[PDB]
Amino acid sequence: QVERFTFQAEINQLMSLIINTFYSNKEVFLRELISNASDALDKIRYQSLTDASVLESKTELEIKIIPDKTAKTLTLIDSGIGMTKTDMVKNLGTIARSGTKNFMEQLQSGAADISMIGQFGVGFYSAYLVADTVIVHSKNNDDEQYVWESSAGGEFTIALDHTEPLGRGTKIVLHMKEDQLDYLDETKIKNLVKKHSEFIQYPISLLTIKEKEVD
């Protein structure tokens, strides 16, 4: 069963700004999503320093990135703390901090730019610089696996997830814009991932799917 929600007014505005106005360093999205993956890993790691048994659902702490030219998708998977269902509504549909609300005014005035979005915990929405639709699958130790989706337009959905179990963590699937497809190209994505993960302390693996006709 599919459950439907409205973005908080500010999140709608953030998303319109990202979708409808111009910004020339769209590649910032990758920095933001890798940073979010790192933070979720930090969090499970932190818990495990008290109770190593929290890692039982999935023992590796790593990040995987999978460009798929045929599906037109860029997938980023981490084995971080994951989000419960309520985590997901809170984190991907709302703003918590008043600081985040006022940053939104600074941003919308043009005084701040999109690249500082992470300082205010909404770096995720930068995915919409390069993607028309975003799917987030997540699994936290204290809840079931859920799947969130939004193509923006003021609304998002959440459903029980019946796809491949993560064990623990988050998988973000960006359905790429027609014009932003070179982010799926091997050399470009390799360089970008390298550039934007230099201080990340978790292993990051990049997949390359090659497809050749056999003659």
Side-chain angles (χ1 to χ4, degrees), residues 9-55 57-89 91-100 102-154 156-163 165-184:
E10 297 84 320
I11 291 300
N12 276 333
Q13 296 171 11
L14 174 55
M15 286 174 76
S16 301
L17 183 71
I18 288 164
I19 296 162
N20 304 328
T21 76
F22 173 80
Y23 182 58
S24 37
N25 305 124
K26 294 189 172 58
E27 78 176 64
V28 297
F29 84 95
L30 185 60
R31 190 191 64 187
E32 301 305 313
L33 292 186
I34 289 175
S35 161
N36 279 4
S38 188
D39 291 346
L41 288 163
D42 279 356
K43 285 182 197 173
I44 201 65
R45 189 170 161 195
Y46 182 65
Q47 288 192 352
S48 82
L49 299 183
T50 275
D51 176 16
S53 69
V54 300
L55 300 176
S57 43
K58 179 138 207 149
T59 70
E60 304 88 349
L61 308 160
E62 57 191 349
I63 296 173
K64 314 229 172 216
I65 299 175
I66 311 106
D68 185 328
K69 305 201 208 171
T70 308
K72 286 168 189 203
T73 52
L74 182 60
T75 302
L76 299 96
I77 309 177
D78 68 74
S79 51
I81 201 178
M83 293 173 282
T84 69
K85 191 191 202 178
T86 308
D87 289 347
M88 227 168 198
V89 177
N91 292 353
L92 304 169
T94 81
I95 284 321
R97 339 170 192 191
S98 213
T100 299
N102 306 348
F103 174 68
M104 275 312 306
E105 300 193 338
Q106 207 172 331
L107 186 55
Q108 271 178 116
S109 80
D113 83 292
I114 303 271
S115 62
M116 57 225 65
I117 199 176
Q119 288 152 47
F120 283 92
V122 292
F124 163 77
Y125 297 102
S126 89
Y128 295 95
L129 284 179
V130 301
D132 290 314
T133 301
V134 181
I135 321 294
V136 185
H137 302 259
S138 192
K139 173 74 167 70
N140 181 276
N141 284 349
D142 297 334
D143 200 3
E144 303 300 311
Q145 189 163 316
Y146 284 95
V147 59
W148 173 108
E149 175 180 354
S150 179
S151 307
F156 66 91
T157 63
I158 297 186
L160 268 144
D161 191 7
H162 291 297
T163 55
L166 300 177
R168 187 192 60 248
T170 295
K171 171 167 76 182
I172 299 175
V173 181
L174 303 199
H175 282 94
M176 299 297 280
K177 293 191 208 307
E178 207 46 53
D179 37 304
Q180 304 299 343
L181 292 173
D182 57 357
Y183 281 106
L184 306 184

